[PDB]
């Protein structure tokens, strides 16, 4: 088979425990083949939770214990914290040739509280400007659940060409951030008296705007 | 505790071979109770183990990739490469070096990890960013530096050489119609400091060697 | 007139499993045990009820010699009185054992990269070896309430298991090839002496 299976996603209460289960084919007998746990935060390389089953390296958290179902081995988290929130892989030797990694577990705290985006627009630059582009940049963070919609605008008509916009990104404080772009000619920023930037949020919606000045 | 530091370049044309090298400080490479291996991580998708190599020479692929992977070691220098023949756009991935312990039948694991390098495989030509500043315009206020239309990916944007972090939000790049990257990084900073404080963005675009430091000053 | 085979057995380019170990009978030949005493590249040299320097002098009917792989752990196990997985359902020796027991590692040749995993260990069975017994059985070991049928499954697991030899073992994990000499005195023309 060699594809080890995790759940897609898993979700928790804080100061409560979770298991991520981690299901293979080969079943090897007691102390033998025992599977790793991996943790990975976002932009980040894997670290290190569990090796041999249960054994967890010097400065990884007692809030972490790994087990076996004999076909299954699970990674059991307590104590939910805000941090655990990232993406979890098992790792184990599968039929004594190749090394593979699970699926991936993405984990999710629950709980989290609704949180209004905050709009950051920028006008083009002088130094863009003279350069005889321009650019508006719309940034938008610190929202949850991390799902926006941007809606551009010339002084109170709507835009279409030259937008650019991100996927939600999870940052350090687990709400999201994105970002947009719109891209002009010098002429169409200076002609318009403003732009503006829509951003909807769960119903709710934020707008900023920039002139030429 | 030990270090792995990875190099090679960011960006491979189609048909090419992939080269990467992996070098080991705070520890001898040449350990007889070690691996070092190599896994991948293709953007959003989950990981793959390459290969790992012994001190004395001896390799073992994932025969998945053994006919495009060869993997060497230079215990003289304490490094060891990867090399992936025939590339494809399937191969653009964070590449990733490991020690891999396998102490017993019981168990094994990959400790410690190198920081990742983002391999593009692209035909498109490197392409160094243009750097313009966000001017803050107003007790915070929200200034910024914009990178744009560079390739390939990553650029790496400090502030104050380092001096800044708290407050800092690089955002993910964006991808243009024109199939060059863009982004903006930005920090929240005091009003009152605006007059006094300098705020200085430092730029770093590894596949074109670009280094620019743009002074960020209010509007005038 | 000659020189006995005793290259045969520990110049060996294979060595058998523990479970099926081989045995080798030593008859009428003349040994000359000062290449073995004589050897440093010995880890483990324990003789019983005889002496290394004290055998050039004595004649024996038959000689068995008995050889395998296991672990450094392991090692420890091929002596008279010892239990664990390799003395109880593997190979044992009796209490009243006559011979030596010989052992050296062998990460080098029985460790392969990638993992050696023809090397095997008996790991269930249902009572203790008796002395110099072999159990080469496969069938599927009953460790439960319900039979198996020759399934594996819940309670019902193969009787051996791997080393999956490779050479970052620790030592204790590392593969170690032994061989085993009984020394065997009947009323017979004894057939085996030294110089
Ligand atoms: C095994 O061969 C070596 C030479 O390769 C020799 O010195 C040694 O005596 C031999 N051992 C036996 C038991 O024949």
């Known amino acids: 088979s060699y594809e080890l299976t995790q759940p897609a996603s898993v979700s928790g209460s804080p100061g409560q425990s979770i298991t991520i289960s981690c299901t293979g084919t080969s079943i090897d007998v007691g102390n033998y083949n025992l599977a790793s746990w991996y943790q990975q935060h976002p932009g980040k390389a894997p670290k290190l939770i569990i090796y041999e089953g249960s054994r967890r390296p010097s400065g990884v958290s007692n809030r972490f214990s790994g087990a076996k179902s004999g076909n299954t081995a699970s990674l059991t988290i307590s104590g939910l914290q805000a941090e655990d929130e990232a993406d979890y892989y098992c790792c184990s030797y599968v039929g004594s040739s190749t090394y593979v990694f699970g699926s991936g577990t993405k984990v999710t705290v629950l709980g989290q509280p609704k949180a209004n985006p905050t709009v950051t627009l920028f006008p083009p630059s002088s130094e863009e400007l003279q350069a005889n582009k321009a650019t508006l940049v719309c940034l938008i963070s610190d929202f949850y659940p991390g799902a926006v919609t941007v809606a551009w605008k010339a002084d109170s008509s709507p835009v279409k060409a030259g937008v650019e916009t991100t996927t939600p990104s999870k940052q350090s404080n687990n709400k999201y951030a994105a970002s947009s772009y719109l891209s002009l000619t010098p002429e169409q920023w200076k002609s318009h008296r403003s732009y503006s930037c829509q951003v909807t949020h769960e119903g709710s919606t934020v707008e900023k705007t920039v002139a030429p000045t | 505790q030990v270090q792995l530091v990875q190099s090679g370049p960011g960006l491979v044309k189609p048909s090419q071979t992939l080269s990467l090298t992996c070098s080991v400080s705070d520890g001898s490479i040449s350990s007889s109770d070690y691996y070092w291996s190599w896994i991948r991580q293709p953007p959003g998708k989950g990981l793959e183990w390459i290969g790992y190599i012994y001190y004395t020479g001896s390799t073992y692929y994932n025969p998945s990739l053994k006919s495009r992977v060869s993997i060497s070691v230079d215990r003289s220098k304490n490094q060891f490469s990867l090399k992936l023949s025939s590339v494809t756009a399937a191969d653009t991935a964070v590449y990733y070096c490991a020690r891999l312990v396998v102490p017993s039948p019981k168990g094994s694991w990959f400790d410690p990890w190198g920081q990742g390098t983002l391999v593009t495989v692209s035909s498109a030509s490197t392409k160094g960013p243009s750097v313009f500043p966000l001017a803050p315009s107003s007790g915070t206020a929200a200034l910024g530096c914009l990178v744009k239309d560079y390739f390939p990916e990553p650029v790496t944007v400090s502030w104050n050489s380092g001096a800044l972090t708290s407050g800092v939000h690089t955002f993910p790049a964006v991808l243009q119609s024109s199939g060059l990257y863009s982004l903006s990084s930005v920090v929240t900073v005091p009003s009152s400091s605006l007059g006094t404080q300098t705020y200085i963005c430092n730029v770093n675009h590894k596949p074109s060697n670009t280094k620019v430091d743009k002074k960020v000053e209010p509007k005038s | ?195």
Not at chain 3, 16 to 21: E, H, K, L, Q, R
Not at chain 3, 103 to 131: E, H, I, M, T
């Open chain 3, 1 to 195: 007139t000659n020189l006995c085979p005793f290259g045969e057995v520990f110049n060996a380019t294979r060595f058998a499993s523990v479970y099926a170990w081989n045995r080798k009978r030593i008859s009428n030949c003349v040994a000359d045990y000062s290449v073995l005493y004589n050897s440093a590249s010995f880890s483990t040299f324990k003789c019983y009820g005889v002496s290394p320097t004290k055998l050039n002098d004595l004649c024996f009917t038959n000689v068995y010699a008995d050889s395998f792989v296991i672990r450094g752990d392991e090692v420890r196990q091929i002596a008279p009185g010892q239990t664990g997985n390799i003395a109880d359902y593997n190979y044992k020796l009796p209490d009243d054992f006559t011979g030596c027991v010989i052992a050296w590692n062998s990460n080098n040749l029985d460790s392969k990269v990638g993992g050696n995993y023809n090397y095997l260990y008996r790991l269930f069975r249902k009572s203790n070896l008796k002395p110099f017994e072999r159990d080469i059985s496969t069938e599927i070991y009953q460790a439960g309430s319900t039979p198996c049928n020759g399934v594996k499954g819940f309670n019902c697991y193969f009787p051996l298991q791997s080393y999956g030899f490779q050479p970052t073992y620790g030592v204790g994990y590392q593969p170690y090839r032994v061989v085993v000499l009984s020394f065997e005195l009947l009323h017979a023309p004894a057939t085996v002496c030294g110089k």
